Design an enzyme around this catalytic site. Structure first.
Site, PDB file in Angstrom:
ATOM      1  N   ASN A   1       0.763   4.296 -11.329  1.00  0.00           N
ATOM      2  CA  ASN A   1      -0.646   4.129 -11.642  1.00  0.00           C
ATOM      3  C   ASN A   1      -1.505   4.123 -10.386  1.00  0.00           C
ATOM      4  O   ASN A   1      -2.604   4.683 -10.388  1.00  0.00           O
ATOM      5  CB  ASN A   1      -0.845   2.858 -12.464  1.00  0.00           C
ATOM      6  CG  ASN A   1      -2.303   2.489 -12.634  1.00  0.00           C
ATOM      7  OD1 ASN A   1      -3.146   3.341 -12.921  1.00  0.00           O
ATOM      8  ND2 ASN A   1      -2.607   1.207 -12.462  1.00  0.00           N
TER       9      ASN A   1
ATOM     10  N   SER B   1      -5.705  11.966 -14.825  1.00  0.00           N
ATOM     11  CA  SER B   1      -7.143  11.867 -14.971  1.00  0.00           C
ATOM     12  C   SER B   1      -7.671  13.096 -15.688  1.00  0.00           C
ATOM     13  O   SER B   1      -7.018  14.143 -15.728  1.00  0.00           O
ATOM     14  CB  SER B   1      -7.830  11.753 -13.613  1.00  0.00           C
ATOM     15  OG  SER B   1      -9.223  11.564 -13.770  1.00  0.00           O
TER      16      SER B   1
ATOM     17  N   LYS C   1      -4.945  14.564  -8.769  1.00  0.00           N
ATOM     18  CA  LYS C   1      -4.415  14.354 -10.107  1.00  0.00           C
ATOM     19  C   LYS C   1      -3.853  15.657 -10.680  1.00  0.00           C
ATOM     20  O   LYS C   1      -2.774  15.670 -11.275  1.00  0.00           O
ATOM     21  CB  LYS C   1      -5.486  13.738 -11.010  1.00  0.00           C
ATOM     22  CG  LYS C   1      -5.907  12.332 -10.571  1.00  0.00           C
ATOM     23  CD  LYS C   1      -4.757  11.318 -10.606  1.00  0.00           C
ATOM     24  CE  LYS C   1      -5.180   9.948 -10.092  1.00  0.00           C
ATOM     25  NZ  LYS C   1      -4.043   8.987 -10.042  1.00  0.00           N
TER      26      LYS C   1
ATOM     27  N   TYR D   1     -10.014  13.641  -5.500  1.00  0.00           N
ATOM     28  CA  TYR D   1      -9.415  12.861  -6.581  1.00  0.00           C
ATOM     29  C   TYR D   1      -8.989  13.793  -7.717  1.00  0.00           C
ATOM     30  O   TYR D   1      -7.841  13.762  -8.165  1.00  0.00           O
ATOM     31  CB  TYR D   1     -10.396  11.800  -7.102  1.00  0.00           C
ATOM     32  CG  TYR D   1      -9.815  10.927  -8.190  1.00  0.00           C
ATOM     33  CD1 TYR D   1      -8.776  10.038  -7.917  1.00  0.00           C
ATOM     34  CD2 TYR D   1     -10.290  10.994  -9.493  1.00  0.00           C
ATOM     35  CE1 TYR D   1      -8.230   9.243  -8.913  1.00  0.00           C
ATOM     36  CE2 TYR D   1      -9.752  10.200 -10.497  1.00  0.00           C
ATOM     37  CZ  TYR D   1      -8.723   9.329 -10.203  1.00  0.00           C
ATOM     38  OH  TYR D   1      -8.192   8.540 -11.198  1.00  0.00           O
TER      39      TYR D   1
ATOM     40  N   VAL E   1     -13.441   5.695 -16.971  1.00  0.00           N
ATOM     41  CA  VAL E   1     -13.116   4.343 -17.439  1.00  0.00           C
ATOM     42  C   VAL E   1     -14.072   3.306 -16.860  1.00  0.00           C
ATOM     43  O   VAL E   1     -14.535   3.439 -15.723  1.00  0.00           O
ATOM     44  CB  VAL E   1     -11.679   3.940 -17.045  1.00  0.00           C
ATOM     45  CG1 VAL E   1     -11.188   2.784 -17.911  1.00  0.00           C
ATOM     46  CG2 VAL E   1     -10.734   5.131 -17.152  1.00  0.00           C
TER      47      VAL E   1
ATOM     48  N   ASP F   1       0.870  -1.179   0.000  1.00  0.00           N
ATOM     49  CA  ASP F   1       0.000   0.000   0.000  1.00  0.00           C
ATOM     50  C   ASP F   1       0.904   1.226   0.000  1.00  0.00           C
ATOM     51  O   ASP F   1       1.818   1.326   0.821  1.00  0.00           O
ATOM     52  CB  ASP F   1      -0.901   0.019   1.238  1.00  0.00           C
ATOM     53  CG  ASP F   1      -1.796   1.250   1.301  1.00  0.00           C
ATOM     54  OD1 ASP F   1      -2.552   1.382   2.285  1.00  0.00           O
ATOM     55  OD2 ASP F   1      -1.752   2.090   0.374  1.00  0.00           O
TER      56      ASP F   1
END
Lengths: 242, 249, 242, 249
Positions: free
Chosen positions: D92, D150, D168, D164, D197, D65
């Site tokens: 990634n 993203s 990014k 999020y 996605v 992690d």
């Protein structure tokens, strides 16, 4: 500078120094109720409040280090407690808190820089939101949120300032969400992005702090920036084009 | 609304209706002398001038189509003749000029959209520059150019609107070149970029976070802000998108 | 480089020189039917076609100055006439065609630069479209359109190159429309944006022409850039971040 | 698919399903040794490794992690121990990690989204760098870092997805700083930026010019392209948005 700024509850983090101070002066001088902020009480805080009280406005000082959430929560409470509500938030609080090259970047330095610049702007903005949303419905107009950006949020950090650059880029971004999901609550979001080598500035000068401050007033004013939300304005002298 | 615009000499193109107009009327209320402009005068003109002189500034109409460099020149000479200089230039003149998809674009169309939006802006600025610079030497401050952009200059234009979108994108870019080599000359360059402006009308108002287009009146203050050396003295090379959150530059 | 490029009708403007040439070589060498282009027949055009014919591909040369529409129309016809259709268009044709400071910029120079760089890319792309749209439905895949950009299309022209910069910016834009209104026709649109002072390039080097060429192949290949459309790729060495 | 990736040593984080996986499998087909990674191994792993060794390269799983700098370090040491170096790094690892609107964000949430997406990327790259650089000295060519971005890093994140999107956006920016001060060290930095996605799924597929999301399989080739000094040797600092035209950077 703008008439409708008269009689407005304005919260400004990091307002004890530089740009945050520069703006605060202009806000009181337009007749507004400003909240000052710093990590620790500055020596002449009360003589400062005297200047602003005289300009047609009113002020107060709430110490808080916003790197922690609970502090952001209280800063919001105590300002609300004095003026009873919020129309404008100015997330000026931040800074390099050092320089470190990539290989030297460790957990301690990382968190010092991340929480100083991001968690501060987030958690505060969170706690201020429902109060801001109130002010807007009350007046039927729009409240305003402003945050301090940087040229580094476009181009990337300077020497050892990687995180500072990317942190401001984080803010440029996170506002775009806030515009999407809280425009309905009557709150605008926008960013003043000051630009400070002299050969890569067409102007030649660096930027002063009273060169920066008006943009803020413009962005808080519903009369002036009524239909503008989700924008970044670089006061840099042509160092970067945006 | 801004103080230091009292008695500043301001040329504004395409400035007799919508945004360009709403901008001018407000420029009157700061006490500035303004160059109204159109292909042809409307009957309105005398009222407009009156109300603008009533509000404490000054007006004066000059007819001109800016699809041709000569008009762009003589237009500057006239303005400058009347008011003996320039302090602020506002390139608003432009427009869709019809809507043709790619296949349907011919040269008379392509020229029309290009000449309307780019050639104008370019040449007008060219002729103005040495005057703008002049006033800037005088003041020891800064003259200002401000060109009207568009949201399409970032997102690409709407149906049959490709050339409009790209022409505005052109302006965004060329201003940067001008910032390089003419900041020296004491002129600041900036762009106010409106989003869409007032069943098809409905469907796009949906996406804009403020659930509508802007009124011409909301695009106006930005220009003054950009005009006011007091307000925007250390800002050049920027773009300000007034679109209710439609796009976030 | 990419397998599916084998047996593909590829039109490349300005392919007689530099980058356009560099790419052309790679396209034939992947087994493709390339169309070369220039203002006037280059001395050794046929010995060039010999190299490409040998690499596994096939080629032809159609002279045309694309500053005019009728020329763009014929260039399209004559390529179609030899290979019968189009899968790939590469709008490499363009250039500074001089330097002039703003005050010196006149109708003659303006039009030389505008039509060289824009009208060319537009009218050509127009005439190529319905043929490209055919190739895509035929194969059920996607045709591809590529145009040559520049760092100047982000930052603005160099000394005297104002129009060149803004013209490439025009192209960056106009593709975004074409993506909106012709993705349904099975055509992708993308841009390779080569970046050429050495102190403002982290790499130090300038860019060669075989440094540029692969991006093009990548962008033409449905296998590789199937789901990518409406993007600009700067091959500049870190001079500008995009 | 690219030649000069035969025998290049490639670490790929979060690389045991979706994009990260599809990327790896293809990296096998170029004949490269790959570091598969997850919090925990799936049962799949042995098949994946097999098929990847079948395709002519090599695999090897490392659990970790990346919310914690120590894991980010030891993970590099393990990989580098096994294959005696690094030629390509692919950050990634990341994810939404839930969806909370602003009010509902607490510190355990904020930390979770930040630690997942930013801290990881940063630290991992830090530890890798001196190894990456090392191989680059050897080759006389370039090692490559590639971080998964993203669309939200440009447009801001979706519902409850604010952190999020911004995380990014952070990566987009920090890569530029790294381009400045470590191009010297022979490492190229770039970003593949996927759109969304694979009733809510439907409504967004409408706007994307290709009327759908991308398959993990369509995001893969870009990474290799960015990995291949042959292909992308003079490209660093860029972002490649694979989104069917959803956003046009």
């Amino acid at each position: 500078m703008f008439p409708d700024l008269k009689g407005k509850r304005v919260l400004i983090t990091g307002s004890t120094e530089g740009i945050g101070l520069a703006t605060a002066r202009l806000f009181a001088r337009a007749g507004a109720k400003v909240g000052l902020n710093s990590h620790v009480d500055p020596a002449n805080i009360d003589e400062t409040i005297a200047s602003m009280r005289a300009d047609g406005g009113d002020a107060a000082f709430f110490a808080a280090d916003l790197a922690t959430s609970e502090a952001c929560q209280q800063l919001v409470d105590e300002f609300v407690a004095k003026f009873g509500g919020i129309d404008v938030l100015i997330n000026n609080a931040g800074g390099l808190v050092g320089r470190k090259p990539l290989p030297e970047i460790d957990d301690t330095f990382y968190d010092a820089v991340m929480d100083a610049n991001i968690r501060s702007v987030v958690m505060t903005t969170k706690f201020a939101l429902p109060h801001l949303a109130a002010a807007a419905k009350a007046s039927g107009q729009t409240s305003a949120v402003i945050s301090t950006g940087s040229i580094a949020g476009h181009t990337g950090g300077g020497p050892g300032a990687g995180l500072y650059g990317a942190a401001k880029a984080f803010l440029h971004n996170v506002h775009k969400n806030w515009v999407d999901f809280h425009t309905k609550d009557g709150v605008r979001f926008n960013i003043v992005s000051p630009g400070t080598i002299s050969n890569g500035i067409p102007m030649g000068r660096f930027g002063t702090a009273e060169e920066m401050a008006p943009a803020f007033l413009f962005f808080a004013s519903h009369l002036a920036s009524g239909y503008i939300t989700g924008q970044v304005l670089d006061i840099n002298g042509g160092q970067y084009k945006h």
